[PDB]
Design a protein around this ligand. Structure first.
Ligand code: MNR
Ligand SMILES: CCCCCCCC(=O)O[C@H](COC(=O)CCCC)COP(=O)([O-])OC[C@@H](O)CO
Lengths: 341, 216, 343, 218
């Protein structure tokens, strides 16, 4: 580890180029990670906040369930005991001052809302605080919700469904706004289902309830594959650079081998140098990443935590160490007779 | 009263391209503490091959080599604890300073580097105070001198010099041999010195002449 | 160019590793390119088909225009003459056998639709053929669209608005489905805007009109930024790898220098080797790229032409050649004395 | 009575670390076609600096070096067209075959590499039908033999040999100096040959003794 560290000192140039490459890849991965978690919470935060155990859908032609096409009839709700119907629709909201499209979720009157959302389902519509400010509306003002006049029951926090904030209404109001005889679009089950489901019904886990949302699976899947290529590219870049680079050092390694340096010593030296270089690159990438992400998290959906910056950071660095050992394997094969030449 | 190195009936056979070639042929050499032994001969007579055998840089294809006091140790562990090398090229590691080129041997041996020892040994080679120079601030002779000092850092009992006067003029090459013999005497070293400048035998206690891989 | 090409033949291993990195980066770039263009038409294909010259919006509080918040009152429509009302909404469609959510666009009755879509605006709803197949609805069957029962007037081609297909209806029917007294959400203008607008009005060109679509700017911009990082990463990877690589050949280059090879000879040799390596990597990556995309374009939005695969491919190769010259700059700075002795 | 090479009062001073170093001091050497001029002297005497000077590898810090028939050329154009280098180490390019070691010189001179000449020369050096061999399959003497052949590809006028028997036993080193002498005479080459093996002077038409960068001469 002695020679390895001072090689880095005396040739900071060569390593700056390669560490920058590792830093960019980590920067992209850290920011791509933040963006995929942000988009995922943009699609699921409301359902996930409600935290159901299973979710009962309705299908047509025995196809996979879709939140865009499922409805639960009143009888269907009485069938599943100890469970409430959740209606999910997206429609236009119009105030005297402004308008926009938003998601509307409807639950039976009095059902307590998740602490993420707080409050409890009241008669009328509970608007997200940011949405009420946009519309210059205050609690108690009339608003046009899906072509029907509804009273603003109060303000709430924002959860999301299909890139839209959720307006929470009582099951009766949701029926008027979505123009349906159904009591909801799905059935939320918090306990494990003890009844076996019907031909048109289908039970799903919380995760599977997300894949029934139209945009979610098809866009998270594409983002995850991109992340996989990025992690793979990082490993290959390190291996490619480090194989060529360790070959550059054969002469100095041969001199140490001739002097008596053990194989363990040479392998530790080489891997130590790579570990420092990869650490530098990954730290700078994730540093710049969290900063740029925090700087952008207002214009683009971006989830920024410790696990979402350091998880990928540590993953990339460990891939680099595995890659590095692959590239450094040949430091123990250097014949010491290369030093007598 | 006890030899340091003994090479008994040793031979080396490298695969020279498609065929094989006998480099060393039945070499017999024994050095005692405080001896300067030269090995003379033309280029390609087997000098270097015998040196590399004496440094455990390759086992003989037949015959045995015994370094007493390092019995029961693999070839690499033998070089690290008992043998100092004065390569034909100074082999100074680029990114290290004059003093650091002694210290790294302490580190590869697993002991806290001894700065004072390095400065004393550099001074013992007439580079006193030059511990901080980098390789670019060292003349031809000076690097060879740093090379010798490094060979002395682990305090070996076998000192192997591989034509260490090959890139130095008449004056400088005298100094390196005088230094080599003087150190050989002061620290009771057993030294092999390969050389082609027969003008340097006068400073060796004895010499071997070599031709076609057979010593005479 | 003699030594460079034969280094590749006799040592194909090291070059395969780096060529894979170049190929993977191009593979990622080729599909990201196709995917970003595919999503843009997924957001804009319908309005592009209508091909208006200028487009008049309605705002509140002088904010940026939004397709989710604009309505044109019927008097407002007579002010601007030579204008056509466009109604844009997304709502639920329900058939006797199935249901789904889709976008509905409404235009004045009888206006011929663009040859992109063809047909004419009829009283009722003109459905995309694929949605009718999904819903098991035929010509003449009644469907529930946003809570209103309307008869399927006919099938058309498919255009898209905000990741949804566009159902084309007359202006009157769209008001029933969207529950509004307005005659539309925007106005399509094929001519020069010669009327002056009010403080609350805003005219925009077709490009800027897409900004008024909620998903388009914020998602195309993010994809474009990712592609830019990818191009930079490619350039840096090549520069990083090739600098260390050319430093490996110093000995062989020194020998050719010692023999008398001119600087152009060594530099042409070196870039030839790099250019061949980069060409192989990009071609292999982009080949696999076009294949996976064409294979995937049925399940995920992916627009695939020649320019959207070879444009980016050629761009990467030129970045790499510029990068390589920066790395091979030291091939002409090698003294031949390195060959006289040992290294 | 007309030299190929004229080194007249040539001196070289490299920066030896902090100080400088007069590696060659006013050397005067001349080589005529058909001569094998040996340069003897110990390692560090200035043989190799005189060689490098002779090979237009580096200009002297003082004094002039002339190759006739090639006047008015930069340093590198002189080597590519009128000199052949038998380097101390064979300096074979790894990815090329034996014949390709010669053909690549023909390519760097701008002429479509002539395989016939590359084989004819390989035979003259006694490597007939080995042009297909790769370096890994060539022994010490053979690599050196390819080196000589590569030096002859360009039909040079000055053939410089830097201790080409340095890693060869007595039997093989005779063959190589015989080959050098024989090729020198047979192609009317002007050959400078640096050598530490004093047994090879017999093959040289003249010899220069050297000590500390100064050529000894009566
Ligand atoms: C099949 C479906 C989809 C796929 C695949 C897909 C692929 C990708 C993708 C892939 C690499 C990236 C990155 C991506 C990124 C985005 N995406 Mn996308 N996306 N995406 C949607 C469906 C899909 N996306 C929908 C639906 C919206 C919002 C609609 C609206 O509000 O108008 C949206 C919007 C967005 C937004 C805007 C968020 C905001 O403004 O708050 C971003 C950013
Ligand atoms: C190998 C690389 C491992 C990276 C791990 C990153 C990580 O766990 O972040 C998590 C997200 O993981 C992914 O997006 C999967 C990526 C594949 C962070 O999860 P969160 O719930 O904190 O937000």
């Amino acid at each position: 580890m002695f020679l390895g560290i001072r090689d880095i000192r005396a040739a900071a140039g060569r390593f700056a180029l390669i560490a920058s490459v590792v830093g960019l890849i980590t920067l992209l991965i850290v920011m791509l990670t933040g963006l995929t978690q942000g988009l995922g919470k943009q699609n699921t935060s409301a359902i996930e906040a409600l935290a159901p155990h299973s979710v009962v859908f309705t299908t047509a032609g025995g196809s996979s369930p879709e939140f865009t096409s499922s409805e639960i009839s009143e009888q269907q709700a009485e069938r599943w005991k100890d469970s409430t119907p959740l209606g999910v629709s997206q429609t236009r909201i119009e105030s005297d001052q402004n308008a926009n499209t938003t998601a509307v979720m409807g639950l039976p009157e009095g059902t307590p809302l998740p602490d993420s959302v707080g409050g409890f389902i009241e008669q009328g519509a509970l608007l997200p605080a940011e949405l009420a400010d946009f519309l210059h509306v205050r609690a108690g003002d009339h608003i046009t919700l899906g072509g029907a006049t509804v009273t603003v029951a109060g303000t709430v926090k924002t959860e999301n469904y299909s890139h839209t904030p959720v307006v929470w209404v009582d099951t009766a109001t949701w029926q008027l706004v979505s123009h349906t005889k159904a009591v909801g679009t799905v059935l939320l089950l918090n306990q494990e289902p003890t009844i076996q489901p019907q031909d048109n019904e289908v039970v799903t886990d919380l995760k599977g309830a997300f894949q029934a949302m139209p945009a979610y699976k098809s866009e998270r899947s594409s983002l995850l594959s991109m992340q996989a290529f990025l992690y793979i590219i990082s490993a290959l870049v390190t291996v490619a650079f480090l194989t060529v680079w360790t070959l550059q050092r054969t002469r100095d390694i041969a001199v140490l081998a001739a002097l008596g340096a053990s194989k363990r010593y040479l392998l530790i030296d080489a891997l130590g140098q790579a570990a420092i270089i990869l650490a530098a690159g990954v730290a700078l990438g994730a540093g710049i990443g969290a900063l740029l992400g925090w700087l952008i998290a207002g214009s683009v959906p971006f989830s920024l935590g410790w696990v979402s910056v350091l998880g990928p950071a540590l993953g990339i660095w460990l891939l680099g160490l595995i890659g590095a050992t692959i590239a450094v394997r040949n430091v123990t094969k250097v014949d010491p007779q290369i030093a007598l030449g | 009263a006890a030899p340091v190195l003994s090479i008994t009936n040793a031979s080396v056979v490298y695969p020279d391209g498609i065929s094989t070639v006998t480099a060393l042929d039945s070499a017999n050499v024994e050095i005692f503490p405080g001896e300067l032994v030269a090995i003379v001969g033309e280029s390609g007579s087997g000098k270097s091959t015998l040196l590399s055998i004496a440094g455990f840089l390759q086992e003989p294809t037949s015959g045995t080599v015994t370094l007493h006091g390092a019995e029961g140790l693999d070839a690499t562990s033998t070089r690290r604890e008992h043998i100092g090398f004065v390569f034909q090229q100074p082999n100074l590691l680029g990114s290290l300073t004059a003093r650091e080129q002694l210290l790294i041997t302490d580190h590869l041996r697993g002991i806290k580097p001894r700065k004072d020892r390095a400065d004393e040994l550099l001074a013992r080679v007439g580079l006193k105070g030059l511990g901080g120079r980098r390789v670019a601030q060292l003349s031809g002779g000076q690097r060879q001198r740093v090379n010798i000092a490094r060979a002395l850092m682990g305090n070996p009992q076998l000192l192997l010099a591989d034509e260490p006067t090959s890139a130095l003029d008449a004056r400088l090459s005298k100094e390196i041999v005088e230094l080599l013999r003087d150190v050989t005497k002061e620290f009771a070293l057993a030294t092999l010195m390969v050389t082609h400048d027969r003008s340097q035998l006068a400073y060796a206690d004895r010499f071997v002449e070599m031709a076609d891989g057979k010593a005479l």
